[PDB]
Design a protein. Structure first.
Lengths: 49, 194
């Protein structure tokens, strides 16, 4: 999922109307909560973009 | 089915307010409270009308736009954040529109936003969605500029393209003058080979 999100954000992060940063961040935080992943996910993936 | 009726009645209110502002004393149109009520109402009307996705709404909003423009020019000294957000959403809809019919609306909304910023010197921090605002300004600038480029190149409708060009230019100039650090401007120029 980090791979995929890194990819898509790497394409659309330049146009704020198709890269809902806040919604994406909240959704990734909720997903990390759901799957008990490393809390460093969201920061790492989003900074990678 | 009540379309033509409301249209003519709006033409009436328009001509009435126009002849009023031209001679405000004869109309007793000195009330800045009434002036601001009128300005805000005509603005919001242009907004709600220009929000409908699916030709009538176009012409109606265009009349409302000419009106609001002349009115703001005359009542500037009587004339903001919510207005900024509203003109933002309005320009957003004007962007999702087919170009060949939204030009004048874009120019109007732009001069409106310019008046909104010139009304009070504001830093980027007080501008809601300032990131998105400059983003859209850049998108429109890029598109229309490339267009005017091709138009001037094929010339191997003269003045209006250059007018809109200089307009967006001064617009972005002021927007950058609001962002002294350029960090957002930096992210922008990095996103676009303007």
């Amino acid at each position: 999922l980090h791979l995929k999100i890194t990819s898509l954000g790497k394409i659309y992060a330049s146009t704020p109307r198709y890269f809902p940063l806040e919604f994406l961040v909240k959704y990734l935080e909720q997903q990390v909560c759901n799957f008990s992943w490393d809390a460093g996910f969201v920061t790492y993936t989003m900074q990678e973009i | 089915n009540s379309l033509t009726e409301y249209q003519q009645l709006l033409s009436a209110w328009r001509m009435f307010l126009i002849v009023a502002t031209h001679n405000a004393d004869v109309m007793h149109l000195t009330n800045p409270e009434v002036r601001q009520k009128l300005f805000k109402d005509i603005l919001g009307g242009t907004q709600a009308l220009l929000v409908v996705p699916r030709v009538a709404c176009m012409h109606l909003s265009s009349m409302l736009c000419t009106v609001m423009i002349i009115l703001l020019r005359r009542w500037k000294n009587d004339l903001p954040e919510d207005i900024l957000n509203s003109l933002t959403q309005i320009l957003e809809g004007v962007l999702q529109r087919d170009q060949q019919l939204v030009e004048k609306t874009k120019a109007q909304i732009f001069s409106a936003l310019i008046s909104v910023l010139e009304m009070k010197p504001m830093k980027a921090s007080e501008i809601p969605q300032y990131s998105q605002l400059l983003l859209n300004v850049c998108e429109t600038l890029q598109e229309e500029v490339v267009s005017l480029v091709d138009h001037t190149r094929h010339e191997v409708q003269k003045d209006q393209r250059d007018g809109v060009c200089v307009l967006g230019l001064h617009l972005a100039k002021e927007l950058c003058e609001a962002d002294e650090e350029g960090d957002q401007w930096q992210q922008v120029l990095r996103k676009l080979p303007v």
